[PDB]
């Protein structure tokens, strides 16, 4: 099957450039034309340009113009889409992509699964978790503030509590550090005797945290 | 620029549903569907014909620069957000949800953990959990003076089993700051509530 495959997430300080790679297989390379399109958070999709492999020709749009460079190795059958002078706003998961058919460009039947940038002059640091307690349903939870960049992953009683689970996305504060609650909701008469932990791993400072969730 | 409207439509499920997308020619149409955190589906090209795959409860229509896509009957796996696009152009989009009846938030309050005061830092967590619709506003007051700018909220996409959303706040300061105010409050505004609910403690 036709399939593209993206490198991994991306963090850059402003004005610094990142390089995002889409391995192209099953399908003969050069053949088809490979397209990038971006989504920043919460956003629709954004075109960036198209490289031919075949012989490497490429066109983008004006908004990206000057500052965006695709290359290809033909030989790795990967794409390659390079942005330059980097802005918080070029904050988004990038996809490249394949059009249908060879006649018709621009329908695109294949997508790679995206690769998230953040751009961030914000130091990688790992959140600290504070117990929300509860006061016949209680709620109780766990702030994860102060982290950077995204993701956390927050589970409740290592994976066994999972109903009435609420993780909200994270906001931005004006620290440039991330932070996010995650709530649960639970019989109350339940609150002196089951344990509630939440389980918080950040992988890109390598935290992993449980607190406690006491009345 | 193409445009979709509405950017996001409440449907139930079974009903017929059109999604409208504008265009402008000085040189057709496809559309996709897309999941959070999938990359899109082709499921229309050539302003009318289906993707390999795609169920025929959905058609494309179009004519001059007025683009439809019609689902004939919704389904649960339909809800997501659709994009129309034409050559190097998308448009913003339309997200479907489900319509359910209005649900009021359940509304708690949290006051800063020891942990977290010991830290330096106070965070007031007010949580609103399972109301529909979206809309709803959190006011912070603190010894009565209404806040803002100390804040921010975040809420969650529409839950698979109810339907309902759930939103925080949360009201951050300093540690002095927290400790020269006695009254934190959450004041909660909501279509399904007769009028502003509030919960508060003191420190």
């Known amino acids: 099957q036709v399939q593209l495959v993206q490198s991994g997430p991306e963090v850059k300080e402003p004005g610094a450039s990142v390089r995002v790679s889409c391995k192209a297989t099953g399908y003969t390379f050069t053949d088809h034309f490979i397209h990038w399109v971006r989504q920043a958070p919460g956003q629709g999709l954004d075109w960036m340009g198209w490289?031919?492999?075949?012989?490497?020709?490429?066109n983008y749009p004006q908004k990206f113009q000057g500052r965006v460079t695709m290359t290809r190795d033909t030989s790795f059958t990967t794409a390659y889409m390079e942005l330059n002078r980097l802005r918080s706003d070029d904050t988004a998961v990038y996809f490249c992509?394949?059009?249908?058919?060879?006649?018709?460009?621009?329908?695109?039947?294949?997508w790679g699964q995206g690769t998230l940038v953040t751009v961030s002059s914000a130091s990688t640091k790992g959140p600290s978790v504070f117990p929300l307690a509860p006061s016949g349903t209680a709620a109780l939870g766990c702030l994860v503030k102060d982290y950077f960049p995204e993701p956390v992953t927050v589970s409740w009683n290592s994976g066994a509590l999972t109903s009435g689970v609420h993780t909200f996305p994270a906001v931005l504060q004006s620290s440039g550090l991330y932070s996010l609650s995650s709530v649960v909701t639970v019989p109350s008469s339940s609150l002196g005797t089951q344990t509630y932990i939440c389980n918080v791993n950040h992988k890109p400072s390598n935290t992993k945290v449980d607190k406690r969730v006491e009345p | 620029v193409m445009s979709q409207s509405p950017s996001s439509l409440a449907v139930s499920l079974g009903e017929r549903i059109t999604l409208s997308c504008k265009s402008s020619?000085?040189?057709?149409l496809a559309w996709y569907q897309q999941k959070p955190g999938q990359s899109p589906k082709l499921l229309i090209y050539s302003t009318s014909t289906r993707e390999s795959g795609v169920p025929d409860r959905f058609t494309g229509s179009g004519s001059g620069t007025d683009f439809t896509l019609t689902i004939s009957s919704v389904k649960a796996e339909d809800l997501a957000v659709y994009y129309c696009?034409?050559?190097?152009?998308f448009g913003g989009g339309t997200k479907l949800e489900i319509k359910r009846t209005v649900a009021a938030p359940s509304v708690f309050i949290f006051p800063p953990s020891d942990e977290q005061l010991k830290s330096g830092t106070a965070s007031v967590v007010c949580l609103l959990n399972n109301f529909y619709p979206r809309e709803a506003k959190v006011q912070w007051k603190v010894d009565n003076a209404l806040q803002s700018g100390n804040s921010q909220e975040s809420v969650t996409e529409q839950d698979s089993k109810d339907s309902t959303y759930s939103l925080s706040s949360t009201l951050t300061l300093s540690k002095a700051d927290y400790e020269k105010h006695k009254v934190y409050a959450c004041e909660v505004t909501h279509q399904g509530l007769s009028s502003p609910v509030t919960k508060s403690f003191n420190r």
């Open positions: 490289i031919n492999p075949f012989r490497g020709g490429t």
């Open positions: 992509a394949r059009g249908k058919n060879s006649d018709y460009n621009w329908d695109f039947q294949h």
């Open positions: 696009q034409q050559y190097e152009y």
């Open positions: 020619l000085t040189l057709y």
